[PDB]
């Protein structure tokens, strides 16, 4: 076991090295900042066309159209300002767990419990919407998808691996393999140069797309982590776990920075998102409601209680004008 | 106001009525989840009926449309996707009755049954559990006793009471005997009258659901 102890020595060395740089305790640096106050938001729209519990959603960069998927076998594209249904796509396998919406707006993607990522062409001739590609090769179940270009997409699967594809060829360009449990979430950096993932190891890793190597590993949670999201600067991210706790990590200091927990919240977090300035942090819970946190002070600043079942998805527009939340309730609201 | 937005509203209404029709059409089917241990009887039950990630099967019997989902080809954390099947009409659990000797296997089947019966999502759904391979059990019961798997069995080594003992051991594993029912059937590889048993169990489930909806329950 001479080679099974050098790992322990290196772990101790890493712990000491990143404990030698901890001298500030962020909550002790933001002591003089003034609190945000009380954040009070009202629902502006209710979007009701689904006949089952919706599992994912995504905003368009237009900041007006969004897509949502449910176990009813449909994903349908909405117009937020008027609540008009622009499209309604019948999809082949009813067990879908994720959605994505291309930055250009020409395509959408879907996937789920059938091990396949499907890509649909929205802006086609001849009228209707068609299936462009159908990417196979995972062995688990699609957990998340994110478009890079019109011809590139990173996927996360419950077979412990992530992958990078090119859509016209249909083959995996690169595979990232360092986790030991299922991979449940994914987040692209603002410049799409490197991303971060969260698995059922209670650990998160930082990959770079151009070389397929893990750069850093972040630990500190106590259970499965279900959500992940970058800070708008691209130099930190937040996580959400079954631990009933979120927490903020730092890519340059290489360690935890703060934790967001309450003594009377004993339930897991399903989703996580930030604000346009990155000052307050949203988080969806299984308590049928989602909390708003003050990211620089850890205090609670509000509550969004308008659903009658678990909130399973949550997103904020690119212009920071509204937030949308879906739930197993089968509705999704827009809060401004 | 609403210059050519009226065409958009009309399109929304048309696709909305199409969604309503599709939902109504899909709300009159019974969905069945097919569980079981590793290669117990799950393959032959699909042939008893008319017939990557999961495999769906369709069939009809007396003006009723069925749907079996087999999720045995997906090895991963089961607690991360088992809540998708909440609301399934019933569960079909296949147990190999002749695997009380090989390895232990019956104890694994018992552990799986106990884990699935007392789950946080399936606290209400009923179970239709088959005991496959009773002819091999006929053959093997005389050669070797049933005390190999149950050390506390006190009875003759004949099929007629060993089968009842095994059935009772499976029956008495559920902690809610006033809320969920368990239907047992000693099936085999021939005389395909199993779909009638499934039909009767599903009809009882449907009657109970209707009673709950009407407010009488």
């Amino acid at each position: 076991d001479q080679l099974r102890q050098e790992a322990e020595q290196l772990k101790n060395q890493i712990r000491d090295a990143r404990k030698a740089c901890a001298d500030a305790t962020l909550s002790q640096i933001t002591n003089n900042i003034d609190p945000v106050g009380r954040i009070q938001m009202r629902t502006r729209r209710t979007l009701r066309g689904h006949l089952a519990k919706i599992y994912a959603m995504h905003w368009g960069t237009d900041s007006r159209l969004l897509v949502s998927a449910s176990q009813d076998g449909k994903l349908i594209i909405w117009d937020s300002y008027t609540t008009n249904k622009v499209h309604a796509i019948p999809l082949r396998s009813s067990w879908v767990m994720t959605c994505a919406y291309a930055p250009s707006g020409n395509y959408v993607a879907c996937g789920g419990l059938d091990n396949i990522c499907s890509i649909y062409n929205l802006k086609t001739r001849e009228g209707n919407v068609r299936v462009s590609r159908e990417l196979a090769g995972h062995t688990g179940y699609l957990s998340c998808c994110r478009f890079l270009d019109d011809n590139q997409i990173v996927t996360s699967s419950g077979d412990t691996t992530c992958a990078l594809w090119d859509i016209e060829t249909g083959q995996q360009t690169t595979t990232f393999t360092g986790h030991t449990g299922d991979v449940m979430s994914l987040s692209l950096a603002p410049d799409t140069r490197l991303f971060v993932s969260g698995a059922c190891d209670a650990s998160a890793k930082l990959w770079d797309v151009r070389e397929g190597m893990c750069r850093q590993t972040f630990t500190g949670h106590e259970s499965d982590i279900n959500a992940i999201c970058f800070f708008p600067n691209g130099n930190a991210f937040a996580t959400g776990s079954d631990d009933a706790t979120c927490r903020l990590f730092d890519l340059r200091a290489d360690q935890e920075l703060m934790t967001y927990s309450h003594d009377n919240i004993i339930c897991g977090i399903t989703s996580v998102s930030f604000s346009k300035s990155g000052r307050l942090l949203l988080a969806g819970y299984d308590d049928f409601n989602c909390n708003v946190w003050d990211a620089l002070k850890a205090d609670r600043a509000g509550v969004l209680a308008g659903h009658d079942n678990r909130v399973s998805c949550l997103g904020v527009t690119d212009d920071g004008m509204a937030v949308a939340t879906g739930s197993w309730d089968s509705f999704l609201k827009i809060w401004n | 106001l609403s210059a050519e937005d009226k065409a958009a509203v009309e399109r929304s209404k048309m696709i909305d009525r199409n969604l309503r029709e599709d939902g109504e059409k899909a709300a009159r089917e019974v969905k069945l989840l097919l569980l079981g241990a590793g290669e117990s009887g799950k393959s032959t039950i699909v042939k008893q009926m008319k017939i990557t990630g999961i495999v769906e099967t369709h069939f009809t019997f007396k003006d009723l449309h069925f749907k079996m989902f087999d999720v045995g080809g997906q090895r991963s954390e089961r607690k991360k996707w088992i809540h998708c099947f909440e609301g399934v009409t019933a569960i079909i659990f296949c147990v190999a009755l002749s695997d009380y000797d090989l390895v232990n296997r019956m104890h694994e089947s018992m552990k799986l049954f106990d884990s699935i019966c007392n789950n946080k999502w399936f606290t209400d759904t009923s179970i239709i559990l088959f005991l496959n391979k009773k002819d091999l059990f006929e053959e093997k019961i005389k050669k070797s006793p049933l005390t190999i798997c149950y050390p506390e069995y006190a009875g003759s080594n004949t099929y007629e009471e060993a089968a009842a003992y095994i059935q009772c051991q499976f029956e008495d594993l559920n902690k809610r005997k006033d809320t969920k029912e368990i239907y047992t059937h000693f099936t085999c590889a021939t005389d395909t009258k199993n779909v009638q048993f499934v039909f009767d169990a599903v009809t009882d489930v449907i009657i109970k659901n209707n009673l709950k909806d009407c407010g009488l329950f």
Partner: single-chain antibody
Amino acid sequence: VQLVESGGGLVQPGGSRKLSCSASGFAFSSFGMHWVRQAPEKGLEWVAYISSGSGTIYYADTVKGRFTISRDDPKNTLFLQMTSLRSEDTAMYYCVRSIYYYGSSPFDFWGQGTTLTVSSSDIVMTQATSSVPVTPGESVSISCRSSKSLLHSNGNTYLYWFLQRPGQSPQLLIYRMSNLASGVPDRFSGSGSGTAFTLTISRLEAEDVGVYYCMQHLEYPLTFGAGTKLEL
């Protein structure tokens, strides 16, 4: 994508006729369809409109009562029943494909035309010029003008530009005054405030010679312009 019309020919005044438009190559039941006609040596003029699902129909005031529009979705055909044909109905009839949702481009594909011969508060769109001589490589501008502000309270101005080359059917260029239809080279551009619009062609070669029309989609009936012709 194809639209083919049939049912023309010489008719006597007071008679009746029926035209057909057989569509093949696109999802027919998702598109609303129009009938547009053009006199022997004159501009275009709208006739009738049948929505998707047949839930809405409109007619021009000069044909209301005598004409009837209907569609048969399973057969992929569009009909127009004409009765009491007077001598003013001599024209060529086009079949036009149009779909409306958020961000679509209606009026994009036109049929090919069938010629019919009969024996012997509206918004006014003004296209003052009627001909301009041009040279290849230069830049040309074309101006339209409306009697009412085409800007709506939701920020959309509803102005459309078409092109009809010699011997062919017209073709969409710009929709809602600034958007380029797919397949149109980026030489063309559109601009202008409410009640005054302009089309700009930069570095124009051959195959840009024809008549340019200007249409409003703010409210029915839809009205066209007189047309500006570019000669060589």
